[PDB]
């Protein structure tokens, strides 16, 4: 009965009942370890096991984090998550470090056990029920319930927000320089010290969470070749946004002149001043794609007129809290990706490219998932949002093995698109 | 401004330890990427690694005398020290202790060496 | 126990010259290779980390080079100090090591 704390209520939006999704297939290493810690967890009593007789359900499976070799348990509470919600938006939403963004190095603690220390309420347990699967079925699946705050739940946060204000009050009136956010099981802590200060006023705001029962995970840094460890702070610096350019050839071909017309065309959505009929008149009747042109003074006139206008921000963009988040991804080619974070319809709120870890094992799926992974990072930092994601691929393949390069506490939303190449639109050179 | 100087006895009987002492200024064992490392050199062959120390403590040993050495530091007098256990004549050498350090993702090595203590084995 | 190998012990040239040192491993160490200059005196600098990357304070005439198993330092146009020993050092995976080192001398 971990604590005196009165249980905040919650009650999911209405007329939707709780979540009832089904758990997929997990592999031996992630049950052997998902059944281990799970049993710990409910020996401690934060868990409970229950039966059939509750008929909602959420999926979970465990990652062997990188970041500290130590198994962390996962549940895809996003169905819950979103089941509700006057919550932890409106009612309890935890404000945004406009600043955040602004810091030279900035880390991210798993401050998840944090919420093992919070009865969850009588009554909106049944909800986060989950389930453990069986190699080849060997038994039925073996259930359980929260009964203290769980962790990767959108409530949690919001619930544990005050009990966390508090246990940072100290070090920010200690450290005024510092800036820390928090989004669900995760602390964004970012400063403007030398790295090598950073690292240490991170390690010791690491001891004041200890020195108040908030046991954060222990990293590891290795001093064999690649020093993975090295990225484990952000940087939003190096965080450029990433205009679309129209090509450069001496002599256009046919070919080459409907390529930049179309495209041309396309931005012109973006920003309004791209024209493309004084432009498009060099192709006036049905000719050979081959034929070379002869740029007129009246054409190449605008053609170096309208890539000034691809330098610059958009057309007066605004950021609404209050609306959702989008981001696209298109797999560029040989390791590259390109995104756009957009509220509207080509008002995109910023574009990128995520170049590629070398560990990308030249694996499509495990470089998306990264992608994903990186983008949603930013976002968080950002804006504070998790965007909903298109991503370029099939459903069945990404379900297939999203988890295995998985290394996050949280889950954005996402959904899948068949768009082919449009026009290189995001640009590839 | 950053400075190792090993320290010693120079001088040790057979089947007697000796403890080198690495006084450094112009970095800390505390700072992340740091570490400082013991490097050997007999009588005229070539460079031989002893052992690193790092600041988590993550030492390493050179495997052919882990059973005759040990590593150790003082964080708050910037010293750093090396001690061998029955050393035999053939650890008769000039050794180096040099300030270690991980820069990025990919670099790390002896950025700054000392200029070494001559330690030989003599009844 | 990576050995690492410098077939090239004594080398003589002279001023001016141009040279070029081998450093040869047992195993892919995918560049995380180190030069390092000891002087007749005994100091001993560093040149190069990571194969390839200068060392801040070191003149422009040093480069090196290598991938895999075989990696090359080339001294630019000889001056007086460069004749020396040289060193490569191997940090792909402890115990680290080290070559066997290369005198280069004076033609005379």
């Known amino acids: 009965p971990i604590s005196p704390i009165e249980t905040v209520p919650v009650k999911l939006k209405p007329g939707m009942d709780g979540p009832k999704v089904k758990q997929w297939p997990l592999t031996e290493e992630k049950i052997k370890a998902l059944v281990e810690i799970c049993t710990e967890m409910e020996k401690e009593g934060k868990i409970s096991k229950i039966g059939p007789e509750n008929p909602y359900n959420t999926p979970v499976f465990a990652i062997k984090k990188k970041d500290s070799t130590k198994w962390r348990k996962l549940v895809d509470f996003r169905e819950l998550n979103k089941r509700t919600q006057d919550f932890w938006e409106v009612q309890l939403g935890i404000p945004h470090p406009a600043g955040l963004k602004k810091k030279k190095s900035v880390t991210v603690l798993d401050v998840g056990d944090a919420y093992f220390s919070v009865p969850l309420d009588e009554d909106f347990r049944k909800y986060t029920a989950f389930t453990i699967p069986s190699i080849n079925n060997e038994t039925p699946g073996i259930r359980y319930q929260y009964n203290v705050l769980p962790q990767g739940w959108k409530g949690s946060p919001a619930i544990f927000q005050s009990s966390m204000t508090k246990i940072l009050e100290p070090f920010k009136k200690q450290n005024p320089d510092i800036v820390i956010y928090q989004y669900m099981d995760d602390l964004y802590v970012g400063s403007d010290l030398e790295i090598g200060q950073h690292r240490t006023k991170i390690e010791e705001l690491r001891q004041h969470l200890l020195r108040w029962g908030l046991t954060t995970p222990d990293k590891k840094h290795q001093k064999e070749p690649p020093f993975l460890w090295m990225g484990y702070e952000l940087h939003p610096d190096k965080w450029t946004v990433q205009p679309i350019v129209l090509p450069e050839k001496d002599s256009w071909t046919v070919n080459d002149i409907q390529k930049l017309v179309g495209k041309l065309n396309w931005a012109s959505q973006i920003y309004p001043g791209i024209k493309v009929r004084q432009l498009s008149k060099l192709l006036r009747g049905t000719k050979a794609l081959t034929e070379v042109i002869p740029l007129t003074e009246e054409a190449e006139l605008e053609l170096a007129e309208n890539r000034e206008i691809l330098k610059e921000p958009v057309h007066g963009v605004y950021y609404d809290p209050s609306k959702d988040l989008i981001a696209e991804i298109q797999k560029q080619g040989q390791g590259q990706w390109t995104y756009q974070i957009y509220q509207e319809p080509f008002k995109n709120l910023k574009t990128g490219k995520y170049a590629r870890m070398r560990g990308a094992h030249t694996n499509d799926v495990k470089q998306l998932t990264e992608a994903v992974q990186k983008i949603t990072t930013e976002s968080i930092v950002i804006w504070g949002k998790t965007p909903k994601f298109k991503l370029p691929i099939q459903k069945e393949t990404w379900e297939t093995w999203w988890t295995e390069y998985w290394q996050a506490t949280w889950i954005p939303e996402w959904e899948f698109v068949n768009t082919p190449p449009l026009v290189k639109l995001w640009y590839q050179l | 401004q950053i400075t190792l100087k090993e320290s010693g006895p120079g001088i040790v009987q057979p089947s007697q330890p000796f403890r080198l002492t690495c006084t450094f200024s112009g970095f800390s064992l505390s700072t992340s990427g740091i570490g400082v490392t013991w490097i050997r050199q007999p009588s005229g062959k070539g460079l031989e690694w002893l052992a690193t120390?790092?600041?988590?403590?993550?030492?390493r040993y050179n495997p052919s005398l882990k059973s005759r050495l040990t590593v150790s530091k003082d964080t708050s007098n910037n010293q750093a020290f090396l001690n061998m256990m029955t050393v035999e004549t053939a650890d008769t050498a000039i050794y180096y202790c040099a300030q270690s350090a991980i820069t990025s993702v990919t670099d790390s090595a002896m950025d700054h060496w000392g200029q070494g203590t001559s330690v030989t084995v003599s009844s | 126990d990576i050995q690492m190998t410098q077939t090239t012990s004594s080398l003589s040239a002279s001023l001016g010259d141009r040279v070029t040192i081998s450093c040869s491993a047992s195993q892919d160490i995918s560049s995380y290779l180190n030069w390092y200059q000891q002087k007749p005196e005994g100091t001993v600098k560093l040149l190069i980390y990571?194969?390839?990357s200068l060392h801040s304070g070191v003149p422009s005439r040093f480069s090196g080079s290598g991938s895999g198993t075989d990696y090359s330092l080339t001294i630019s146009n000889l001056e007086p100090e460069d004749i020396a020993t040289y060193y490569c050092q191997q940090y792909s995976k402890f115990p680290w090591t080290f070559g066997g080192g290369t005198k280069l001398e004076i033609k005379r």
């Open positions: 120390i790092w600041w988590d403590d993550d030492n």
């Open positions: 990571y194969t390839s």
